[PDB]
């Protein structure tokens, strides 16, 4: 300490031992003159808080930590964002799926079914755990319109659906059917329901996480899940309620065996055989939980909690112009490679709420009335509308009063410092409303 | 940045007077005659008129 303290500035007098320099964006004189073209995730600040000098002029002056000692500073910071649930940036507004796109009676008498992969995109916005799903199913439909239907494709065969129920609760071990004649609409984890010849890929989307279907060994570029994969676990068919009820008057067999085939407005349930009790529709959930664990999807995939945020990602601070470049970091000027002084999780959590609207809706569509762009197939038990789970989650932004350690810094702090927040991939982050830094230099050793 | 670099500096130690070896590679392509090296002009005195 002794002669090694002195923290000096132009003529303003000697200050001794730790003090405080401030890194702030909202500083009025600065904005107008320096970071006009920049944004909160990468700006310039005048660290000289002296009322009498131009910002430019200040950019000349310097804070001089005494030369005789290696100094260090404590970096506390206040980060506050407002990034939405889904958006193009975090890759939560896109997802490739393969659907039916054409159905025509080929040239002889046999038929043709051609499928294709299409990328559907969501309208940017902050959503629910559910409404997001819905938005996806809708985006599937919206396509069936611009193309599908108008080419021999019947809703009775739309290839992909994201629902949320255990399509085999009512199931009866012997009858081979969902006895109650209705797939019990309770919510049990996001799922994926496919059809023959199609599937979905998330290779470039974090939405996967929203669903909660994670790859059992992630570091494998690529995420395709198709029909052939979902093996063992095709949605069993609903038993014919009426045929059964209507019977019992007059070897003497009963109406049981009759597995419903279609529903009001005659929508095909595409059953494998005119025999088998299983429909062609295949569910991930079903597969994972019910089909061979050592071979099924239960093998290469993992069932887990949703998380609307789509994945806690972190950000990296960098104060290139004011702090020594940490161990192996190379010093540069390429914004997308500055040295990093602190890491921290991007300020987003998921609040959970109890859903009353769970059942309230089961007592309104039972009393017929209009429909949403979401339940375009009310009377279908499958292309219906996935049941709203009790307890929805919602991505919520929150101020993060974080605190990075104490770092080594240069002893000639420039009048104008540059602040820069970066993300995992290394790029500014548009969704930053406020960055604030406080540094407290203090002597560490001697030269 | 090049600009930014223009700020930084190479510091040969202060306590000693330094020196450097300067090797250089120069390559031209100047032509024989040209206006610059003054090889494209030359004054001469000639006959310009003949009348009785």
Short mmCIF file of C-alpha atoms in Angstrom, two decimals:
data_model
loop_
_atom_site.label_atom_id
_atom_site.label_comp_id
_atom_site.label_asym_id
_atom_site.label_seq_id
_atom_site.Cartn_x
_atom_site.Cartn_y
_atom_site.Cartn_z
CA UNK A 1 0.00 0.00 0.00
CA UNK A 2 2.16 2.94 1.24
CA UNK A 3 3.13 4.83 -1.94
CA UNK A 4 1.34 2.37 -4.20
CA UNK A 5 -2.24 3.66 -3.68
CA UNK A 6 -2.67 6.98 -5.40
CA UNK A 7 -5.53 6.89 -7.89
CA UNK A 8 -5.07 10.03 -9.95
CA UNK A 9 -7.02 12.09 -12.42
CA UNK A 10 -6.22 15.39 -14.22
CA UNK A 11 -5.64 18.05 -11.55
CA UNK A 12 -8.75 16.94 -9.59
CA UNK A 13 -6.47 15.77 -6.72
CA UNK A 14 -5.21 12.44 -5.20
CA UNK A 15 -7.76 9.87 -4.18
CA UNK A 16 -6.39 7.00 -2.06
CA UNK A 17 -7.21 3.27 -2.13
CA UNK A 18 -10.34 1.77 -3.69
CA UNK A 19 -12.90 4.17 -5.21
CA UNK A 20 -15.55 3.72 -7.91
CA UNK A 21 -15.78 4.09 -11.66
CA UNK A 22 -19.17 3.78 -13.34
CA UNK A 23 -20.16 2.07 -16.58
CA UNK A 24 -23.59 3.42 -17.58
CA UNK A 25 -25.61 3.60 -20.81
CA UNK A 26 -28.47 5.96 -19.94
CA UNK A 27 -25.93 8.81 -19.56
CA UNK A 28 -27.49 11.62 -21.63
CA UNK A 29 -24.50 13.45 -23.08
CA UNK A 30 -23.05 10.11 -24.28
CA UNK A 31 -26.02 8.76 -26.21
CA UNK A 32 -26.44 11.70 -28.53
CA UNK A 33 -22.71 11.77 -29.35
CA UNK A 34 -21.24 8.27 -29.25
CA UNK A 35 -23.44 5.21 -29.32
CA UNK A 36 -26.09 6.61 -31.67
CA UNK A 37 -25.89 3.66 -34.02
CA UNK A 38 -25.38 1.13 -31.22
CA UNK A 39 -27.67 -0.68 -28.81
CA UNK A 40 -27.77 -1.63 -25.16
CA UNK A 41 -25.84 -4.81 -25.75
CA UNK A 42 -22.80 -3.05 -27.18
CA UNK A 43 -22.22 0.61 -26.40
CA UNK A 44 -19.72 3.23 -25.42
CA UNK A 45 -19.64 5.13 -22.17
CA UNK A 46 -17.66 8.01 -20.92
CA UNK A 47 -16.35 6.83 -17.54
CA UNK A 48 -15.15 10.36 -16.71
CA UNK A 49 -18.05 11.76 -14.72
CA UNK A 50 -16.78 15.35 -14.85
CA UNK A 51 -19.41 17.87 -15.74
CA UNK A 52 -17.01 20.24 -17.54
CA UNK A 53 -15.65 18.27 -20.46
CA UNK A 54 -16.94 17.31 -23.91
CA UNK A 55 -17.50 13.59 -24.25
CA UNK A 56 -14.96 13.64 -26.99
CA UNK A 57 -12.56 15.69 -24.94
CA UNK A 58 -13.08 13.37 -21.97
CA UNK A 59 -12.21 10.42 -24.15
CA UNK A 60 -8.72 11.84 -23.91
CA UNK A 61 -8.27 12.15 -20.15
CA UNK A 62 -7.55 9.08 -18.05
CA UNK A 63 -7.97 7.56 -14.65
CA UNK A 64 -4.55 6.43 -13.48
CA UNK A 65 -4.40 3.66 -10.94
CA UNK A 66 -0.98 3.92 -9.37
CA UNK A 67 1.75 2.51 -11.50
CA UNK A 68 3.70 0.80 -8.76
CA UNK A 69 0.98 -1.75 -8.07
CA UNK A 70 -1.00 -4.36 -9.97
CA UNK A 71 -4.62 -3.34 -9.44
CA UNK A 72 -7.88 -5.19 -9.46
CA UNK A 73 -11.53 -4.15 -9.38
CA UNK A 74 -14.80 -5.64 -8.21
CA UNK A 75 -17.31 -5.84 -10.97
CA UNK A 76 -20.92 -5.81 -9.95
CA UNK A 77 -23.48 -5.54 -12.63
CA UNK A 78 -27.17 -5.06 -13.26
CA UNK A 79 -28.53 -6.76 -16.34
CA UNK A 80 -32.14 -6.51 -17.45
CA UNK A 81 -33.73 -7.98 -20.54
CA UNK A 82 -37.16 -8.54 -22.02
CA UNK A 83 -36.65 -11.24 -24.62
CA UNK A 84 -39.90 -13.06 -25.56
CA UNK A 85 -40.67 -16.76 -25.37
CA UNK A 86 -40.59 -17.47 -29.10
CA UNK A 87 -38.60 -15.48 -31.61
CA UNK A 88 -36.20 -15.56 -34.49
CA UNK A 89 -32.85 -15.21 -32.81
CA UNK A 90 -33.19 -17.81 -30.19
CA UNK A 91 -34.54 -20.11 -32.85
CA UNK A 92 -37.91 -20.62 -31.24
CA UNK A 93 -40.04 -19.51 -34.15
CA UNK A 94 -39.14 -22.20 -36.65
CA UNK A 95 -39.35 -25.96 -36.87
CA UNK A 96 -39.25 -28.38 -39.76
CA UNK A 97 -41.92 -31.04 -40.08
CA UNK A 98 -42.76 -33.46 -42.88
CA UNK A 99 -46.40 -33.52 -43.97
CA UNK A 100 -48.74 -34.83 -46.62
CA UNK A 101 -48.81 -32.40 -49.52
CA UNK A 102 -50.53 -34.36 -52.30
CA UNK A 103 -53.03 -37.12 -52.84
CA UNK A 104 -54.04 -38.25 -56.32
CA UNK A 105 -55.22 -41.58 -57.88
CA UNK A 106 -52.12 -42.55 -59.85
CA UNK A 107 -52.27 -43.40 -63.57
CA UNK A 108 -53.24 -47.07 -63.34
CA UNK A 109 -55.61 -47.59 -60.35
CA UNK A 110 -53.05 -47.57 -57.54
CA UNK A 111 -52.52 -44.39 -55.70
CA UNK A 112 -49.95 -41.82 -54.93
CA UNK A 113 -49.04 -40.15 -51.70
CA UNK A 114 -46.17 -37.71 -51.85
CA UNK A 115 -44.81 -36.05 -48.74
CA UNK A 116 -42.44 -33.15 -48.17
CA UNK A 117 -40.57 -31.25 -45.44
CA UNK A 118 -41.73 -27.73 -44.88
CA UNK A 119 -40.60 -25.13 -42.42
CA UNK A 120 -43.33 -23.50 -40.46
CA UNK A 121 -42.83 -20.29 -38.62
CA UNK A 122 -44.65 -18.75 -35.68
CA UNK A 123 -45.73 -15.18 -35.21
CA UNK A 124 -43.16 -13.75 -32.81
CA UNK A 125 -44.43 -13.20 -29.28
CA UNK A 126 -44.24 -14.32 -25.66
CA UNK A 127 -46.41 -17.35 -25.05
CA UNK A 128 -47.64 -20.00 -22.73
CA UNK A 129 -46.40 -23.51 -22.51
CA UNK A 130 -49.59 -24.55 -24.23
CA UNK A 131 -50.68 -21.77 -26.54
CA UNK A 132 -47.27 -22.26 -28.07
CA UNK A 133 -48.10 -25.87 -28.89
CA UNK A 134 -51.40 -24.66 -30.33
CA UNK A 135 -49.62 -22.06 -32.42
CA UNK A 136 -47.60 -24.94 -33.88
CA UNK A 137 -50.57 -27.17 -34.63
CA UNK A 138 -52.21 -24.16 -36.25
CA UNK A 139 -49.11 -23.49 -38.32
CA UNK A 140 -49.44 -27.10 -39.55
CA UNK A 141 -53.05 -26.54 -40.56
CA UNK A 142 -52.45 -23.12 -42.08
CA UNK A 143 -50.21 -24.98 -44.48
CA UNK A 144 -52.68 -27.75 -45.20
CA UNK A 145 -54.82 -24.91 -46.52
CA UNK A 146 -52.39 -23.13 -48.80
CA UNK A 147 -51.54 -26.57 -50.19
CA UNK A 148 -52.72 -29.86 -48.72
CA UNK A 149 -56.51 -29.95 -49.23
CA UNK A 150 -56.40 -28.38 -52.66
CA UNK A 151 -54.58 -31.50 -53.83
CA UNK A 152 -56.65 -34.43 -52.62
CA UNK A 153 -55.53 -34.22 -49.00
CA UNK A 154 -58.27 -34.81 -46.44
CA UNK A 155 -57.95 -33.55 -42.91
CA UNK A 156 -58.67 -37.22 -42.21
CA UNK A 157 -54.96 -37.66 -42.96
CA UNK A 158 -53.03 -34.61 -41.80
CA UNK A 159 -49.66 -36.09 -40.76
CA UNK A 160 -48.41 -34.26 -37.58
CA UNK A 161 -50.06 -33.12 -34.39
CA UNK A 162 -48.68 -31.94 -31.08
CA UNK A 163 -51.18 -32.94 -28.40
CA UNK A 164 -50.65 -33.76 -24.68
CA UNK A 165 -52.61 -36.77 -23.47
CA UNK A 166 -51.94 -40.41 -22.75
CA UNK A 167 -53.71 -41.92 -25.70
CA UNK A 168 -54.33 -45.20 -23.95
CA UNK A 169 -55.69 -44.85 -20.51
CA UNK A 170 -59.16 -46.25 -21.06
CA UNK A 171 -57.55 -49.16 -22.91
CA UNK A 172 -58.77 -52.63 -21.97
CA UNK A 173 -56.18 -55.47 -22.05
CA UNK A 174 -58.59 -57.90 -23.70
CA UNK A 175 -60.98 -55.98 -25.91
CA UNK A 176 -57.91 -54.24 -27.33
CA UNK A 177 -59.81 -50.96 -27.15
CA UNK A 178 -60.20 -47.67 -25.34
CA UNK A 179 -63.45 -48.88 -23.81
CA UNK A 180 -64.99 -45.54 -22.74
CA UNK A 181 -65.11 -44.71 -26.45
CA UNK A 182 -63.19 -41.50 -25.79
CA UNK A 183 -59.47 -40.93 -25.28
CA UNK A 184 -59.50 -39.56 -21.72
CA UNK A 185 -58.50 -35.92 -22.38
CA UNK A 186 -56.24 -35.27 -19.38
CA UNK A 187 -52.88 -33.57 -19.92
CA UNK A 188 -49.67 -35.58 -19.33
CA UNK A 189 -46.62 -33.94 -21.01
CA UNK A 190 -46.34 -32.49 -24.58
CA UNK A 191 -46.27 -35.26 -27.16
CA UNK A 192 -45.93 -35.77 -30.84
CA UNK A 193 -48.45 -37.69 -32.89
CA UNK A 194 -47.39 -38.79 -36.32
CA UNK A 195 -48.80 -40.67 -39.25
CA UNK A 196 -47.33 -43.01 -41.79
CA UNK A 197 -44.77 -41.44 -44.06
CA UNK A 198 -44.00 -38.35 -42.05
CA UNK A 199 -42.36 -36.86 -38.99
CA UNK A 200 -40.70 -33.82 -37.51
CA UNK A 201 -37.20 -32.45 -37.15
CA UNK A 202 -35.95 -29.91 -34.61
CA UNK A 203 -32.36 -29.92 -35.82
CA UNK A 204 -32.58 -26.12 -35.78
CA UNK A 205 -34.99 -25.23 -33.00
CA UNK A 206 -35.06 -25.02 -29.27
CA UNK A 207 -38.79 -25.62 -29.38
CA UNK A 208 -37.84 -29.22 -28.80
CA UNK A 209 -37.10 -28.24 -25.24
CA UNK A 210 -40.45 -26.53 -24.93
CA UNK A 211 -42.04 -29.90 -25.73
CA UNK A 212 -39.64 -31.58 -23.38
CA UNK A 213 -38.41 -34.29 -25.71
CA UNK A 214 -34.63 -34.19 -25.38
CA UNK A 215 -32.10 -36.28 -27.26
CA UNK A 216 -30.46 -38.81 -24.94
CA UNK A 217 -26.99 -37.71 -26.07
CA UNK A 218 -27.28 -34.05 -27.21
CA UNK A 219 -23.88 -33.36 -28.65
CA UNK A 220 -25.12 -35.08 -31.83
CA UNK A 221 -25.94 -32.50 -34.45
CA UNK A 222 -29.39 -33.39 -35.77
CA UNK A 223 -32.85 -34.11 -34.39
CA UNK A 224 -35.20 -36.05 -36.64
CA UNK A 225 -38.01 -38.12 -35.25
CA UNK A 226 -40.13 -39.93 -37.85
CA UNK A 227 -42.91 -42.47 -38.05
CA UNK A 228 -40.70 -45.51 -38.39
CA UNK A 229 -38.99 -44.40 -35.17
CA UNK A 230 -42.13 -44.27 -33.08
CA UNK A 231 -42.50 -48.01 -33.10
CA UNK A 232 -44.85 -49.94 -30.88
CA UNK A 233 -47.30 -47.43 -29.48
CA UNK A 234 -49.82 -46.58 -32.15
CA UNK A 235 -52.88 -44.97 -30.64
CA UNK A 236 -55.42 -47.77 -29.95
CA UNK A 237 -58.88 -47.16 -31.39
CA UNK A 238 -61.92 -45.95 -29.47
CA UNK A 239 -64.55 -48.64 -28.94
CA UNK A 240 -67.90 -48.15 -30.66
CA UNK A 241 -70.01 -46.86 -27.79
CA UNK A 242 -73.35 -47.01 -29.62
CA UNK A 243 -72.93 -50.33 -31.41
CA UNK A 244 -72.29 -51.76 -27.96
CA UNK A 245 -75.09 -49.90 -26.15
CA UNK A 246 -77.59 -50.37 -28.98
CA UNK A 247 -76.97 -54.09 -28.61
CA UNK A 248 -78.16 -56.48 -25.89
CA UNK A 249 -81.65 -57.60 -27.00
CA UNK A 250 -80.79 -60.80 -28.93
CA UNK A 251 -73.59 -67.94 -30.83
CA UNK A 252 -74.97 -64.74 -29.23
CA UNK A 253 -71.87 -62.48 -29.42
CA UNK A 254 -71.90 -58.78 -28.50
CA UNK A 255 -71.21 -55.41 -30.32
CA UNK A 256 -67.90 -55.10 -28.47
CA UNK A 257 -65.45 -56.03 -31.23
CA UNK A 258 -66.63 -52.99 -33.22
CA UNK A 259 -63.90 -50.34 -32.91
CA UNK A 260 -65.24 -47.01 -34.06
CA UNK A 261 -63.98 -46.05 -37.50
CA UNK A 262 -64.86 -42.43 -38.02
CA UNK A 263 -66.50 -39.55 -36.27
CA UNK A 264 -69.46 -37.25 -36.91
CA UNK A 265 -68.72 -35.67 -40.29
CA UNK A 266 -67.14 -39.05 -40.95
CA UNK A 267 -63.42 -38.41 -40.42
CA UNK A 268 -61.38 -41.59 -41.02
CA UNK A 269 -59.43 -42.89 -38.04
CA UNK A 270 -57.24 -44.73 -40.49
CA UNK A 271 -57.16 -48.16 -38.84
CA UNK A 272 -54.42 -50.51 -39.96
CA UNK A 273 -56.74 -53.46 -40.78
CA UNK A 274 -60.53 -53.65 -40.93
CA UNK A 275 -59.54 -56.04 -38.14
CA UNK A 276 -56.85 -54.66 -35.76
CA UNK A 277 -57.89 -52.50 -32.84
CA UNK A 278 -54.98 -50.10 -33.45
CA UNK A 279 -55.15 -46.92 -35.52
CA UNK A 280 -52.25 -45.91 -37.76
CA UNK A 281 -51.69 -42.83 -35.61
CA UNK A 282 -48.48 -43.15 -33.52
CA UNK A 283 -47.64 -41.24 -30.28
CA UNK A 284 -44.22 -40.46 -28.92
CA UNK A 285 -45.41 -40.57 -25.33
CA UNK A 286 -46.92 -43.97 -26.00
CA UNK A 287 -43.74 -45.23 -27.61
CA UNK A 288 -41.41 -44.00 -24.89
CA UNK A 289 -43.56 -45.36 -22.06
CA UNK A 290 -45.11 -48.47 -23.56
CA UNK A 291 -42.99 -49.88 -26.37
CA UNK A 292 -39.80 -51.90 -25.83
CA UNK A 293 -37.50 -49.80 -23.63
CA UNK A 294 -34.31 -51.34 -25.01
CA UNK A 295 -35.29 -50.70 -28.66
CA UNK A 296 -38.01 -48.08 -28.75
CA UNK A 297 -37.56 -44.37 -28.63
CA UNK A 298 -37.22 -44.79 -24.85
CA UNK A 299 -33.70 -45.75 -25.88
CA UNK A 300 -32.20 -42.79 -27.80
CA UNK A 301 -34.46 -40.13 -26.33
CA UNK A 302 -35.30 -38.73 -22.92
CA UNK A 303 -38.59 -37.67 -21.36
CA UNK A 304 -38.40 -34.52 -19.29
CA UNK A 305 -39.91 -31.31 -18.01
CA UNK A 306 -41.02 -28.62 -20.52
CA UNK A 307 -39.49 -25.22 -19.60
CA UNK A 308 -40.98 -22.49 -21.72
CA UNK A 309 -37.74 -20.47 -21.85
CA UNK A 310 -36.51 -23.19 -24.21
CA UNK A 311 -33.19 -23.40 -22.45
CA UNK A 312 -31.28 -21.40 -19.91
CA UNK A 313 -28.57 -19.80 -22.05
CA UNK A 314 -25.85 -17.55 -20.73
CA UNK A 315 -24.23 -14.31 -21.76
CA UNK A 316 -20.70 -12.97 -21.57
CA UNK A 317 -19.59 -9.54 -20.42
CA UNK A 318 -16.49 -7.90 -21.86
CA UNK A 319 -14.85 -4.62 -20.92
CA UNK A 320 -11.93 -4.70 -23.40
CA UNK A 321 -10.91 -1.13 -22.84
CA UNK A 322 -10.71 -1.35 -19.04
CA UNK A 323 -9.69 -4.80 -17.85
CA UNK A 324 -6.85 -7.13 -18.44
CA UNK A 325 -7.59 -9.97 -20.77
CA UNK A 326 -8.09 -13.22 -18.77
CA UNK A 327 -5.59 -16.03 -19.05
CA UNK A 328 -5.73 -17.49 -22.49
CA UNK A 329 -7.75 -14.82 -24.22
CA UNK A 330 -6.15 -13.10 -27.13
CA UNK A 331 -6.53 -9.33 -27.31
CA UNK A 332 -8.41 -8.05 -30.37
CA UNK A 333 -10.83 -5.57 -31.90
CA UNK A 334 -13.30 -7.97 -33.46
CA UNK A 335 -16.41 -7.33 -31.36
CA UNK A 336 -17.41 -10.95 -31.71
CA UNK A 337 -14.21 -12.16 -29.99
CA UNK A 338 -13.41 -9.70 -27.24
CA UNK A 339 -12.05 -11.09 -23.99
CA UNK A 340 -14.61 -12.20 -21.43
CA UNK A 341 -14.58 -11.10 -17.85
CA UNK A 342 -17.83 -12.48 -16.59
CA UNK A 343 -20.44 -15.04 -17.48
CA UNK A 344 -24.01 -15.08 -16.34
CA UNK A 345 -27.32 -16.69 -17.14
CA UNK A 346 -29.56 -14.69 -19.51
CA UNK A 347 -32.20 -13.15 -17.10
CA UNK A 348 -35.16 -15.39 -17.83
CA UNK A 349 -37.16 -17.64 -15.53
CA UNK A 350 -40.39 -19.58 -15.81
CA UNK A 351 -43.24 -18.71 -13.47
CA UNK A 352 -45.92 -21.35 -12.93
CA UNK A 353 -49.64 -20.85 -12.39
CA UNK A 354 -52.61 -23.05 -11.57
CA UNK A 355 -55.04 -23.59 -14.41
CA UNK A 356 -58.76 -23.39 -13.65
CA UNK A 357 -59.44 -23.03 -17.37
CA UNK A 358 -58.53 -26.73 -17.45
CA UNK A 359 -62.09 -28.01 -17.25
CA UNK A 360 -64.11 -24.82 -17.68
CA UNK A 361 -63.70 -25.51 -21.44
CA UNK A 362 -65.06 -29.06 -21.23
CA UNK A 363 -68.34 -27.44 -20.24
CA UNK A 364 -68.73 -25.10 -23.22
CA UNK A 365 -67.91 -27.23 -26.29
CA UNK A 366 -70.25 -29.82 -24.87
CA UNK A 367 -72.75 -27.01 -25.30
CA UNK A 368 -72.08 -26.37 -29.04
CA UNK A 369 -70.97 -22.91 -30.33
CA UNK A 370 -68.34 -21.38 -32.64
CA UNK A 371 -64.77 -22.66 -32.94
CA UNK A 372 -61.23 -21.34 -32.74
CA UNK A 373 -58.60 -21.60 -35.36
CA UNK A 374 -57.39 -24.16 -32.83
CA UNK A 375 -60.21 -26.67 -32.68
CA UNK A 376 -60.95 -27.08 -36.35
CA UNK A 377 -61.87 -30.71 -35.75
CA UNK A 378 -63.88 -30.68 -32.48
CA UNK A 379 -65.56 -33.92 -33.33
CA UNK A 380 -62.42 -35.94 -33.79
CA UNK A 381 -60.99 -37.23 -30.54
CA UNK A 382 -57.60 -36.96 -32.18
CA UNK A 383 -57.22 -33.87 -34.31
CA UNK A 384 -59.21 -32.32 -31.47
CA UNK A 385 -57.47 -29.76 -29.30
CA UNK A 386 -54.94 -31.00 -26.78
CA UNK A 387 -56.27 -30.58 -23.22
CA UNK A 388 -54.95 -27.58 -21.33
CA UNK A 389 -52.63 -28.80 -18.61
CA UNK A 390 -53.28 -27.58 -15.08
CA UNK A 391 -50.24 -25.48 -14.16
CA UNK A 392 -49.00 -23.56 -17.17
CA UNK A 393 -45.64 -21.90 -17.30
CA UNK A 394 -44.73 -18.56 -18.78
CA UNK A 395 -41.36 -17.13 -19.72
CA UNK A 396 -40.77 -14.11 -17.52
CA UNK A 397 -38.02 -11.50 -17.76
CA UNK A 398 -36.38 -10.31 -14.56
CA UNK A 399 -33.65 -7.86 -13.51
CA UNK A 400 -30.50 -9.66 -12.53
CA UNK A 401 -28.41 -7.95 -9.90
CA UNK A 402 -25.47 -10.21 -10.45
CA UNK A 403 -21.89 -9.95 -9.21
CA UNK A 404 -18.79 -11.17 -11.00
CA UNK A 405 -15.61 -11.56 -9.04
CA UNK A 406 -12.75 -9.13 -8.61
CA UNK A 407 -10.67 -8.75 -11.78
CA UNK A 408 -7.24 -7.43 -12.68
CA UNK A 409 -7.33 -4.16 -14.61
CA UNK A 410 -5.06 -1.76 -16.53
CA UNK A 411 -3.63 1.19 -14.61
CA UNK A 412 -4.57 3.67 -17.29
CA UNK A 413 -8.30 3.57 -17.68
CA UNK A 414 -9.38 5.39 -20.81
CA UNK A 415 -11.84 8.24 -20.71
CA UNK A 416 -14.20 6.16 -22.83
CA UNK A 417 -14.84 2.53 -22.08
CA UNK A 418 -16.67 0.04 -24.20
CA UNK A 419 -19.21 -2.34 -22.73
CA UNK A 420 -20.33 -5.48 -24.53
CA UNK A 421 -22.70 -8.28 -23.70
CA UNK A 422 -22.56 -11.39 -25.83
CA UNK A 423 -24.42 -14.66 -26.05
CA UNK A 424 -23.29 -18.24 -26.25
CA UNK A 425 -22.86 -17.96 -30.04
CA UNK A 426 -21.11 -14.62 -29.65
CA UNK A 427 -23.22 -11.80 -30.95
CA UNK A 428 -24.91 -8.81 -29.38
CA UNK A 429 -28.34 -9.52 -27.90
CA UNK A 430 -31.12 -7.19 -29.12
CA UNK A 431 -33.28 -7.99 -26.11
CA UNK A 432 -31.20 -6.01 -23.61
CA UNK A 433 -32.95 -3.02 -22.02
CA UNK A 434 -30.32 -2.15 -19.46
CA UNK A 435 -26.73 -2.92 -18.64
CA UNK A 436 -25.01 -1.31 -15.67
CA UNK A 437 -21.56 -1.73 -14.33
CA UNK A 438 -19.87 -0.69 -11.13
CA UNK A 439 -16.16 -1.19 -10.64
CA UNK A 440 -14.22 -0.82 -7.42
CA UNK A 441 -10.49 -0.94 -8.02
CA UNK A 442 -8.21 -1.84 -5.13
CA UNK A 443 -4.51 -2.73 -4.89
CA UNK A 444 -3.54 -6.38 -5.28
CA UNK A 445 0.25 -6.64 -5.25
CA UNK A 446 3.36 -4.69 -6.18
CA UNK A 447 5.52 -4.11 -9.23
CA UNK B 1 -9.66 -2.30 -36.22
CA UNK B 2 -6.91 -0.63 -38.20
CA UNK B 3 -7.99 2.59 -36.63
CA UNK B 4 -8.11 1.06 -33.19
CA UNK B 5 -4.69 -0.50 -33.75
CA UNK B 6 -3.31 2.90 -34.65
CA UNK B 7 -3.71 3.53 -30.94
CA UNK B 8 -1.82 0.60 -29.44
CA UNK B 9 1.96 0.58 -29.40
CA UNK B 10 5.00 -1.63 -29.45
CA UNK B 11 7.18 -0.64 -26.52
CA UNK B 12 10.86 -1.38 -26.75
CA UNK B 13 12.12 -1.30 -23.20
CA UNK B 14 12.60 2.14 -21.85
CA UNK B 15 15.85 1.54 -20.04
CA UNK B 16 17.83 0.97 -23.23
CA UNK B 17 18.56 2.80 -26.46
CA UNK B 18 17.35 0.42 -29.16
CA UNK B 19 18.27 -0.11 -32.76
CA UNK B 20 16.80 -2.15 -35.60
CA UNK B 21 18.07 -3.80 -38.76
CA UNK B 22 16.27 -2.57 -41.79
CA UNK B 23 16.15 -4.90 -44.73
CA UNK B 24 14.00 -3.95 -47.61
CA UNK B 25 12.58 -5.21 -50.88
CA UNK B 26 12.05 -2.58 -53.53
CA UNK B 27 10.58 -3.31 -56.94
CA UNK B 28 9.80 -0.87 -59.71
CA UNK B 29 8.82 -0.88 -63.36
CA UNK B 30 9.70 2.59 -64.60
CA UNK B 31 10.09 2.77 -68.42
CA UNK B 32 13.07 3.93 -70.43
CA UNK B 33 11.63 7.24 -71.60
CA UNK B 34 8.99 9.19 -69.74
CA UNK B 35 7.91 12.52 -68.39
CA UNK B 36 9.16 12.42 -64.84
CA UNK B 37 12.65 11.34 -65.42
CA UNK B 38 12.83 13.91 -68.18
CA UNK B 39 13.52 11.45 -70.95
CA UNK B 40 10.63 12.38 -73.19
CA UNK B 41 11.62 15.93 -74.05
CA UNK B 42 14.54 17.67 -75.69
CA UNK B 43 14.95 21.07 -77.27
CA UNK B 44 16.47 21.38 -80.71
CA UNK B 45 16.76 24.31 -83.10
CA UNK B 46 15.56 23.69 -86.64
CA UNK B 47 14.75 25.40 -89.92
CA UNK B 48 11.17 26.60 -89.83
CA UNK B 49 10.93 28.96 -92.81
CA UNK B 50 12.45 29.56 -96.21
CA UNK B 51 11.28 32.41 -98.44
CA UNK B 52 12.93 34.61 -101.14
#
